Symmetry: D6
Subunit: 169 residues, 12 copies
C-alpha cells in the first residue's frame, strides 16, 4: 500500500468541505464552523502565495484519505504548527503515522525548519501515542483553551526538533 502527499489544489476543495472535522485544521482561516463552499474557496484564493502555510492532501493507494499541513510557518524562529485529519475509515490502519512522517520530512528536510509543534486534546490517548512514537514530546498544557461540544477542554502542546529528527531519520 502506497501513501503520498500532494499539494492541496483548488479542485480538492469539495473533498475538504465534506470532511467532518475540517474546521479544526483551518482555525486560522475561520472561527464559525459550517462555512459555505464559496467561503472556503474564497479563503483558499486569498492565501495563494502565503509563505506561512503549506497544505497537503494525503493519498493512500491513489485515493484522497485526509489532509496534513504546516501552518504558522515562521522563518525567523524556524518553526511551524503541524496539523492532520484522516477520513474516519482510514483511521487505525497506520495511515496517520505514515502521513505525519512525510509531513515531518517536508518540514525538516525540505523547508529546513528547527522546530515543529502541534496541539492535541489531552484526552486523545490514541493521537498522543502516535505523536510520541514519531518523536514528539509533551511541551505543556493549555488549560481550557478550546470550547468544544459544550464544555471547555484542555489541550497539550507537543514538539520535536530538527536535530532529533535528522539523528533518527
Amino acid at each position: 500500500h502506497s501513501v503520498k502527499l500532494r499539494p492541496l489544489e483548488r479542485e480538492d476543495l469539495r473533498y475538504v468541505h465534506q470532511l467532518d472535522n475540517n474546521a479544526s485544521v483551518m482555525r486560522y482561516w475561520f472561527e464559525e464552523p459550517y462555512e459555505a463552499f464559496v467561503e472556503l474557496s474564497d479563503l483558499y484564493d486569498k492565501h495563494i502565495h502565503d509563505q506561512s502555510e503549506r497544505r497537503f492532501v494525503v493519498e493512500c493507494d491513489g485515493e484522497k484519505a485526509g489532509l496534513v499541513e504546516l501552518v504558522e510557518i515562521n522563518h525567523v524562529h524556524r518553526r511551524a504548527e503541524f496539523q492532520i485529519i484522516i477520513s474516519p475509515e482510514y483511521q487505525g490502519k497506520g495511515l496517520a503515522t505514515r502521513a505525519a512522517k512525510l509531513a515531518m520530512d517536508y518540514g525538516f528536510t525540505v523547508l529546513n525548519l528547527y522546530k515543529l509543534y502541534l496541539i492535541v486534546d489531552k484526552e486523545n490517548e490514541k493521537a498522543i501515542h502516535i505523536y510520541r512514537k514519531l518523536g514528539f514530546s509533551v511541551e505543556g498544557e493549555l488549560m481550557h483553551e478550546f470550547f468544544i461540544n459544550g464544555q471547555y477542554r484542555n489541550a497539550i502542546r507537543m514538539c520535536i526538533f530538527q536535530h532529533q529528527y535528522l539523528a533518527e531519520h
Copy 2:
C-alpha cells in the same frame, strides 16, 4: 428518519428563492419581498465571511426541507437571533422541533453563545408551543411591530440561556 443541518450554499439559492415565506428570514438583507434571484445571490456574495450570521439548510432523509439560522450574532453580548422556515409539506411532523434543537446545539455547544432569542407572531400558537417545549420562555411583546397582509400585528420575543440548555441537553 434522519434530520441534519448543512451550510446554506450558493448552489442552494434557487431552493431558497422558491420558498413561500423566505423574506421573513432575510429581513436584515432586504425589506421589499419578491426580490429577484440575482438580488438574492448578490446579497449572499456580499455576506460571505460575515461573522454576524450562519445560515443552514435543513435536510430530512436527504432532501431540502427548510432553513434555520442564527443572525445578528453579537460576540460581546454573546447572543443571536434564531429563525426557522420549514417547507409546508414537512410541517406538523416534528421536523421543526428536531431542526431547531440542532441549531440550538450549534449556538450553545459550538459557538458558545449565552443567549438565543426569536420573534414569533402572537397568534402562532403552534409555533409558540414548539418553542416552549424546547425551553424558550416568553420575554415580551413587540406591539404593532410588523405590517403583514394589510394590518399591524403583534409579535412576541422568546429567549433561552446557555445554562438552561446545557443543564437539560
Copy 3:
C-alpha cells in the same frame, strides 16, 4: 385559470425585450425606444437593490403573459406609480384586472403604501374602465404630456388610497 405574479428575473429579459410596447413601462430607464438587449440587461443590473422599484412578471396558467410594476416608490410620501402591460393575446379576458388587483394588494397590503397612482392615455376608454372598476379615480389631466406616433397626446392621472382599498378588499 390561475393568475400569479413573480419577480422579474434577469432570465426573463428576453421576454420583456420582445414585448411590443415594453418602453412605455420603462420610461424612467430609457427614453429612446428600440433599446438593444444588452442595454436592457445592463440597466436591470444597475437597478438591483433599487428600493424605488419592484417589477413583476404576470403568469397565467403558468405562462408569461405580461408585466406589472410599482415604480417611483417614495417611502416618505408613501406612494408609487403603478404600470402594467399585457401581451395582446391575453387582452380582453379579465387578465389585466386580476393582475392589477395582485399588484394593488402588494402595494397596499405588503409594502404599506398610502397612495397608488397611474397614467393612462385619455383616449384609452377600455383601460380607464378597468381602473375605475378597481377603485382608481381620475385625479387630473396632463396636457400634451407625451409625443406618440407623431402628435402630442393627453394623459390622465388616476389614483387610489390605502384606506379605500382596505375597506373594500
Copy 4:
C-alpha cells in the same frame, strides 16, 4: 439691480447645504431631509454629465440668492420640471419673478423645450400668483401627494408651452 443665473458649481454646495428648504428641490436625489454635506457632494459628482438636469445659482447684485433648475428633462417629449428656491431675505422683492423668467428663457430659447411644468403647494397663493403672471396655467391637482410637517398636503401642477412663451417674450 442685476439678476443673473450661473451654473451650480461643486464649490457652491456649502451654500446649497445651508439653504433651509433645499430638500424640496432635490427630491429626485434624496428622500430623507437633512443629508450630510458629503452625501450632497457625492450625489453632485454622480450627476455630472446628466442630460436630464441643469441646476443654477441665482445671483442678485453679485451675491448668491437662491437656486433655479430644470429637472426631469425628457428629450423625446420635450419637457422639464421647473423648480426654484430663493433665500428668505430675497423674497417679496421681485427676485423670484426675474429668476424664473431667466430659467424659462433657458428652457424655451436655449434648450428648445415644448413644455415646462412645476408643482406648488395649493395653499401657496403668493407662489401661484407669481407663476400665473409668468404665463403658467393650472393643469391639475395632485391629492395628498406630499406628507409635510405632519399631514398630507395637496399640490397643484402648472404648465406653460413654448408657443405661448415665444409669442409673449
Copy 5:
C-alpha cells in the same frame, strides 16, 4: 437658549470620537469599543446614502452638545430606533428632553413613521422619566441583553406611535 439639530457631518467625527459613551449609539456599526478614528471615518463613508439611518448633532447655543439619531429605519413596517447621547456637562438641564422632541418631530412629521422605539437600561430612572414625559410607554424587558462593566444587565424597550405624537404635538 436655543437647541437645534443638524446632520452629523464627516467634519464632526472628531467630536463623536471623543464622546465617552459613543459606542452605545453606534452598536450596529461596531461591537468592540475604542475604535480608532479612521475606523469610525471609514464606517461613516460606507454608510453615506444609507436609507436605514439618519444621525444628527445636537447644538445648544451654537455649540455641539450631543448626538441624536434614528437607526434601523424600516420603510415597510414604518418604524425606527431612537438613540441619544448628551455630553455630561449638558445633562440635567432639559437638553435631552428638547433634543429628543426635535428627533421625534423629525421621525413623525418629516419621515412619516408609525412607530419609534428605544432601549434603556432598567436602572436608568432619570432616562425612563424623561422618555415617559415625552410620551414613550414601556413595551417589554430584554433580560440580560447587554454585558456592561462585568455583568449582564437588563434593558427596557419603550415605544410611541405617530397617532399619539400628532394628537399631543
Copy 6:
C-alpha cells in the same frame, strides 16, 4: 413581403462585420477600414446607452438585409444624420425605400426630431433618386470631402423636415 426594423443587437455584430461597406456607416466609430471583430464589439460595448445614436437591423421576410441608423442625434437642435446600407442582393427591389421610410417614421414620429439629413456621393444617381422620392431635398455640396479609392470625391448633403414628413405621411 414584410420589411421591419429591429435594434442592432450585440449578437448581430458578425453580420455587420461581414457587410462589404460597413465602415461607411460607422465613420464616427472608426476611421481605418477593416477593423477586427473585437474592435467592433468593443466599440459597440462603449456606446451602450449613448443617446446620440440608434442603429437598426433591417429585416426582410425575416432575414437580415441591411442596417439603418440615426447618428449624431442632437436634442437641442432636434436633428440627426440618417445612414443606410443594404446587402447587395437586396438592392434594386424597393427595400431601401421601405427601410428608409421606417427609419424616417422613427425619427419624426417616435423621437420627435425636427430635421433629418444625410450625405450621399454626388455620382450615386440611384440613391439620390430614392431620397428625393422620400422627400429629401438637396441642401449643399461638400467638395472633396471624402478620399475614396484613390481620389477625392464630392458629396451632397440632403435634408427633410418634420412638418413636411408629417404633412405627407
Copy 7:
C-alpha cells in the same frame, strides 16, 4: 503687438469657463450650455491624447484673448473643422484674423491637412468677411441647422484647401 498660440492647458479652464459663448466651440463635448466647471474639467481629462482635436489659447501681448481650435480631425480624409472665439474686448482689432492665420498655418504646415472647413451664422457678415480675406470660400448652406435664442438659424459652411493656402502663404 504680439499674437501667439499655445496649447489649451488644464489650468486655463477657468478662463474657458468664464468666456460668454464658450459652448459654441465645444459642441461635440456637450449640448446643454451652462455646464459646471467640474463637468468641463472632466471632459478635458477624458480627451487627453484624443487625436481628433487640438485646442489652443490665443495670447495677445501675453494675455489670454480667446480660443482657436481644430476639431473633428480625420486623418484618412485629411480634414478638420476650424473654430474660434475671441473675448469681446479684443474684437474688431485684427486679432481674429491673426489668430485664424496661425491656426491655418498649424493645420496646413504642421498637421499636413488637405482641407479646413468652418461653420458660421449666415447673418454674421463681419465673420464671413474675415474668413473670405483668409481664403475661405462659401461651400453651402445648412438650413435651420441650429436653434439659437428662440428660433432656427441658417449656417454657412466655408472651406479652404492646402494647395491654395500654400500657394498664397
Copy 8:
C-alpha cells in the same frame, strides 16, 4: 498621576515606529524587524475593522508612554493574547501594572472574554512578578520558541480567567 488607555490611531504610528522593541508586539503583522514607516502604516490600514485585535496607546499624565493590546481575539473560545510595551523611562514606576490592569478590565469587563494569556521570556523575572501580582498563573513553557540576539530562548505562557478577575476586581 493619571494613567489611561486610548485607541491606537493612525496619527500615533510615528510614535510606535520609534519604540525600540515595537516588533515584539506586532509579531503577527510582520516577522522582519526594522520595517519601514510605510510598511507599518499599510499594515495598520489593512487591519482596520479586524475583530481579532484591539491596540491601545498608554497615556501617563497625558503623554504617550507605551502600548497595550489584545490580539488573536477568538470569539468562539473567548480568549485573547495580552501584550504590552512601555517606553524605557516609564519603567519601574508602576505604570506597567496600572496599564495592564486597564487592558485586563477591557478584556474581561468590556469584551466579555473568558481567558487572557501572554508570553514572557523565562528570564524576565521582573515581568513575571508583575503578571503574577495581577493574577496571571504560569501555564507552561515553550522551549526554544524564539531566536533572539543569536540564541534560542525559552518562553513561558501565563494565563488568567474571567471568574478570577471578576472575583478579585
Copy 9:
C-alpha cells in the same frame, strides 16, 4: 485562384503563433522570439483601436496563407512600414506579389498615405526583385542593423510614393 485580405482577428492568433518567422513582423510588439500564445493574445488586446497599425490575414482560395500589414502609421508625415510573411508552401507562386499589391492599394487608395517603406535583408534577392516589380525603389542601407542567427546582417530600406502608385495602378 482568388487572393484576398481580411483583418487579423483574435481567433486567427493560433495561426499567427504557429508561423515560423512570425517575430519578424511583430518587432514592435516584442523582442524575444518564441513568445507564448497568451503573450501574443495579450499584446493583440492591448492594441485594439491602435491607429498606428492595421494587420491582415492573406487568404488564397479561402485558406490562410500569410500576413500582411502596415505598421508605424504616422498621420502627420503620411507614411507607414509595410511587412509581409507568406507560409512557405505558398511561396514562389506569385502570392506575395498579389498580397503586397492589395496592401499597397489599402495604404494608397484607402488610407491616403503618401509614402510606404519596407526593410529587407540585403541578401534576399528574391524579395528585392518582387518589391522592385511592384514599384519600390532602394532608399538606403542599414548597416549591421539586425543580429540574426549569430551574426550581424545588413538591411536595405525600399520605398514608394502615392503619386507613382496611382499613376501606374
Copy 10:
C-alpha cells in the same frame, strides 16, 4: 528522432506541475516546493512579458519531454542562467545534450548574449560531463548554497561565452 523547443504555454502548466523536480527550475518564482496548480498558473500570468526570462518545453518525437530555460536575463551585462529538467524516462539517451544545445543556440544566436552560466550539484558527475562536452567550464564552487534532503550541499557554477560557442558551432 526529432528534438525541438517550443514556448512554455499556459496550457502546458499541468505537465510542468506533475514533473518531479519542477521547483528546482522555478527557484526565482517560489521557494516552498509543492506549490498548488493555481499558485503556478498565477505566477505564470504575473510573468507574461517579463524580459528577464524565456522558458521552453522540450519535445522529442512530438511528445513533451522536459523544460529548458534562460532566466535572470540581464541585457546590460548580456548574460543569463541556463536551467534544464528532463522527464526521467527520457534521461541517458542524449536528449539533455540536444535540448541544451538548442537553448544555447537560442541564447547566443538569437538573443545575442555574451555569457551563459548554470549551477549544478557538485556530486552530479553525469550532468557535469554533459555540460563540459557542450563547452561549459567550471567557474567556481558555491559552498553549502542549498539545503536539500536534510543537509547542506555544494554547487558548482559553470559558464560559456558567445565567442567560444560561435567559434565551435
Copy 11:
C-alpha cells in the same frame, strides 16, 4: 564650465514643455505638436520603467540647458536612436558636442550597446559637422520622410559602432 547629464525627472516637465522644438525628440510619444502639459505628464507616467528609453536633462554650470536621450533601445540587436535638443542660447558654444559625448559614453560604456544611430535634416550642416566630429558616419538618406513647415524634407541617418567609440575614447 561644467556639463553633466541627469535623469529627466517628472518635476523637469515644465522645462521640457516650454522648449521650442520639444516634439521633435518625443516623436514616438505623440504626433500632434503642441500637446498640453497634462498630456506630456501622463505620457511620462505611462513610460516609467520602459526599458526602451532613457532620457536626460543636460546641465551646464548647474542650469537646465537641453535634453539628450537614447530611445528605441533594442536589447537583441543592441542598438538605440540618439536624439538631442539644446536651448537656443546654449547653441554654438560647444555644449551639444559635450552633451552628445556624455550620452554616447552612456550608451557604449554603461548600457553596452553595439550601435547608435540618429536622424538629422539633410540641410542641417552645423549638426552634421558636430556628429561627424564625434565619429558618426552617414548611413543613408530617408527621402521625403518628414513634412515640416509646409513641405516634405529629406533626412539623413548617421551611425557609430561601439568598437569605433571605444578605440577612440
Copy 12:
C-alpha cells in the same frame, strides 16, 4: 562617534537617488542606471512587505552616510546577499567596517540566517581587506560577470557562515 542603522524610509529616497553609485545596490530593481526619482519611488512602493529584502540607512553622528542591505533573502536555504555603499566623504574612516558589522549582526542574530555572501570587484583591494577582517572568505571568481565603464570585469564572491560569526562575536 556613533554609528547606527535604521530602515530605509520612503522619505529617504531623495538621499538614495543622489548617491553616485546607487544602481550597484539596486541591481535586482533596475538595470538601466540613471533611473528617475519617480521610477525609484514606484519600485520602493512595489516592494513594501517583500520578505526577500531589508534595506537600511547608515547613520553616523546622526547624519545619513550610506546604505546597507540584505537582499535575495532565501528562507529555505537560509542565506542572503549583503551589499553596502558609503558616501565618499565617509570612506576610509572605519565606517564601512562598523556598518557592515551591524548588518551582519542583523542577518545572523536577528534574522537567523546560516550564510551571508557578497560580490566585490576583483580589483577592489580595499574592500576585500575590510570584508576579510570581518570574517568573509573568498568563495570563487565570476569571470566577466559585469560590463562596467566599457569593459567586462571580474568579480569575486565572498561568504561567511553563522557558526563562525557567532563564535567570534
